[PDB]
Swiss-Prot record, chain A:
<feature type="zinc finger region" description="RING-type; atypical">
    <location>
        <begin position="63"/>
        <end position="112"/>
    </location>
</feature>
<feature type="binding site">
    <location>
        <position position="55"/>
    </location>
    <ligand>
        <name>Zn(2+) 1</name>
    </ligand>
</feature>
<feature type="binding site">
    <location>
        <position position="58"/>
    </location>
    <ligand>
        <name>Zn(2+) 1</name>
    </ligand>
</feature>
<feature type="binding site">
    <location>
        <position position="44"/>
    </location>
    <ligand>
        <name>Zn(2+) 1</name>
    </ligand>
</feature>
<feature type="binding site">
    <location>
        <position position="41"/>
    </location>
    <ligand>
        <name>Zn(2+) 1</name>
    </ligand>
</feature>
<feature type="binding site">
    <location>
        <position position="84"/>
    </location>
    <ligand>
        <name>Zn(2+) 4</name>
    </ligand>
</feature>
<protein>
    <recommendedName>
        <fullName>GATOR2 complex protein WDR24</fullName>
    </recommendedName>
</protein>
From Swiss-Prot, chain B:
<feature type="binding site">
    <location>
        <position position="59"/>
    </location>
    <ligand>
        <name>Zn(2+) 1</name>
    </ligand>
</feature>
<comment type="subunit">
    <text>Component of the GATOR2 subcomplex, composed of MIOS, SEC13, SEH1L, WDR24 and WDR59. The GATOR2 complex interacts with CASTOR1 and CASTOR2; the interaction is negatively regulated by arginine. CASTOR1 and CASTOR2 convey leucine availability via direct interaction with MIOS. The GATOR2 complex interacts with SESN1, SESN2 and SESN3; the interaction is negatively regulated by amino acids.</text>
</comment>
<comment type="function">
    <text>As a component of the GATOR2 complex, functions as an activator of the amino acid-sensing branch of the mTORC1 signaling pathway. The GATOR2 complex indirectly activates mTORC1 through the inhibition of the GATOR1 subcomplex. GATOR2 probably acts as an E3 ubiquitin-protein ligase toward GATOR1. In the presence of abundant amino acids, the GATOR2 complex mediates ubiquitination of the NPRL2 core component of the GATOR1 complex, leading to GATOR1 inactivation. In the absence of amino acids, GATOR2 is inhibited, activating the GATOR1 complex.</text>
</comment>
<feature type="binding site">
    <location>
        <position position="74"/>
    </location>
    <ligand>
        <name>Zn(2+) 1</name>
    </ligand>
</feature>
<feature type="binding site">
    <location>
        <position position="71"/>
    </location>
    <ligand>
        <name>Zn(2+) 1</name>
    </ligand>
</feature>
<feature type="binding site">
    <location>
        <position position="56"/>
    </location>
    <ligand>
        <name>Zn(2+) 1</name>
    </ligand>
</feature>
<protein>
    <recommendedName>
        <fullName>GATOR2 complex protein MIOS</fullName>
    </recommendedName>
</protein>
UniProtKB/Swiss-Prot annotation, chain C:
<keyword id="KW-0131">Cell cycle</keyword>
<dbReference type="InterPro" id="IPR001680">
    <property type="entry name" value="WD40_rpt"/>
</dbReference>
<feature type="cross-link" description="Glycyl lysine isopeptide (Lys-Gly) (interchain with G-Cter in SUMO2)">
    <location>
        <position position="12"/>
    </location>
</feature>
<dbReference type="InterPro" id="IPR036322">
    <property type="entry name" value="WD40_repeat_dom_sf"/>
</dbReference>
<dbReference type="GO" id="GO:0007080">
    <property type="term" value="P:mitotic metaphase chromosome alignment"/>
</dbReference>
<dbReference type="GO" id="GO:0000776">
    <property type="term" value="C:kinetochore"/>
</dbReference>
<keyword id="KW-0498">Mitosis</keyword>
């Protein structure tokens, strides 16, 4: 009841905090079902291992930032149209000054 | 506006890549993207960066490019 | 055209080597008490300290950086026949590997250009030059030995060839400091052979027949040749032109004497047009090219 009432008012931080420290297993197992993403290397089209940033066959790093050109080991933002992205706070700042994919593929990533 | 025959000479590409690396070293990162846009508009021979993509759990295919929410394949 | 200033940095001993990183925001210095320090810049412009730790058994000669696409990696070479690799975990640097294949004192260590992976070449005082690799970039505790080169002299400095074009094979150059009263050449260049997968001697500068304390290559930036710099009782600049190992047309373009001492170190800049030199007179001099492609002194700074 508490979780539903919190979700009505759109307070996800408190709802997830409650789910994390819940005393019952059924509630604790709510944000664990189907929250895992599978990512693949677009040069070789092969699945990537669960922990690492270097491809197994191409021997190339694939989590390259499209703005700062460093290796992304943490949070990664992604565009579903042209399949490009980078650091969470780099693309966010780039996209409030321009309307082009920073990798330069002629895409208007927000369609505006 | 050079022809596609001379842009394929492996001496212009070396110069372009060296300039891009110089721009990277000085930490001029928005200028490099600005240059990349104007270079991809004119010269279409070179492909952009290659990165990761997200794949469906039941097919194995890519979800890149009819509910907006469901996989385009299955 | 250059103006000097002092930098607020407290040291208790005498500094042996100074090095920079790719962007120019960190530096590493090694001192006489076998300590290495890592200095970080700031937005204001001041330098602060981040680490300090004793490393080796004997004296520490060198310290060098690595490209940031591999992490934060440092390499040091010392008098007790070893070279070590350090990595930053956040901030306390830890040890990863110790190369013990040597039987005499290591004099120089250098990391390889990026496009060949993560590679590292060392050189000793017995006449051996060795090359290591790391087939996994996420496991820096596992290294391998791939090549050995016998020089039949006493090595004192090495340098790689920065060029990354598809038409240049990997290159390396080795100097000698032997004072043997003879007329042997003291700088030779080794080149990779893609067929037999070995290293082979390609050229030998027969005009340098005196002690050599340092050599250095210069960045390509898309030129048609290679530029080399030597540090002997005088400063010289050579050029190599491409024409079994390939053949070169070695010329000479500069021979300066304005130190009246023995020059110790030579280092280039990011573009490869200005040169720095340090002699045994306590001054640092800078050289440049001119409109007539004639090398002329630019500035003189007294330490
Ligand atoms: Zn791959
Ligand atoms: Zn970034
Ligand atoms: Zn794109
Ligand atoms: Zn897009
Ligand atoms: Zn599917």
């Amino acid at each position: 009841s508490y979780i539903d009432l919190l979700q009505r008012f759109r307070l996800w931080n408190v709802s997830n905090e409650v789910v994390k420290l819940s005393t019952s297993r059924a509630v604790s197992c709510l944000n664990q079902a189907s929250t895992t993403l599978h990512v693949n290397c677009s040069h070789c089209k092969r699945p990537m291992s669960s922990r690492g940033w270097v491809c197994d066959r191409c021997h190339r790093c694939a989590s390259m930032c499209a703005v700062c050109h460093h290796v992304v080991k943490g949070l990664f933002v992604w565009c579903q149209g042209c399949s490009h992205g980078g650091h969470l706070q780099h693309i966010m700042k780039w996209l409030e000054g321009s309307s082009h994919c920073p990798a330069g593929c002629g895409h208007l990533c927000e369609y505006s | 506006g050079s022809p596609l025959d001379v842009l394929k000479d492996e001496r212009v590409q070396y110069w372009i890549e060296n300039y891009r690396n110089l721009l990277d070293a000085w930490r001029f990162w928005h200028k490099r993207a600005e240059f990349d846009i104007h270079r991809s508009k004119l010269d279409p021979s070179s492909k952009p960066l290659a990165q990761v993509f997200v794949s469906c759990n039941f097919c194995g295919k890519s979800i890149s490019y009819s509910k907006v929410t469901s996989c385009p394949g299955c | 055209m250059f103006v000097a200033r002092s930098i607020a940095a407290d040291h208790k001993d005498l500094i042996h080597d100074v090095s920079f990183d790719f962007h120019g925001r960190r530096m590493a210095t090694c001192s006489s008490d076998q300590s290495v320090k890592v200095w970080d810049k700031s937005e204001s412009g001041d330098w602060h300290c981040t680490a300090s730790w004793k490393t080796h058994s004997g004296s520490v000669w060198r310290v060098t950086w690595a490209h940031p696409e591999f992490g934060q990696v440092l390499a040091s070479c010392s008098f007790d026949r070893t070279a070590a690799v350090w990595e930053e975990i956040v901030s306390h640097w830890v040890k990863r590997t110790t190369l013990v294949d040597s039987r005499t004192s290591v004099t120089d260590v250098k990391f390889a250009p990026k496009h060949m992976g993560l590679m590292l070449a060392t050189c000793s005082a017995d006449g051996i030059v060795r090359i290591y690799e790391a087939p996994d970039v996420m496991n820096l505790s596992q290294w391998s030995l791939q090549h050995e080169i016998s020089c039949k002299l006493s090595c004192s400095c090495i340098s790689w060839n920065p060029s990354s074009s598809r038409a240049h094979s990997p290159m390396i150059a080795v100097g000698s400091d032997d004072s043997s009263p003879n007329a042997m050449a003291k700088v030779q260049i080794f080149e990779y052979n893609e067929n037999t997968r070995k290293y082979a001697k390609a050229e030998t500068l027969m005009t340098v027949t005196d002690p050599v304390h340092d050599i250095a290559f210069a960045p390509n930036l898309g030129r048609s040749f290679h530029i080399l710099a030597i540090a002997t009782k005088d400063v010289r600049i050579f050029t190599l032109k491409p024409v079994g190992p390939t053949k070169f047309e070695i010329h000479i373009v500069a021979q300066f004497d304005n130190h009246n001492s023995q020059v110790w170190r030579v280092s280039w800049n990011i573009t490869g047009t200005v040169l720095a030199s340090s002699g045994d007179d306590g001054c640092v001099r800078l050289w440049k090219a001119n409109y007539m492609d004639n090398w002329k002194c630019t500035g003189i700074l007294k330490g």
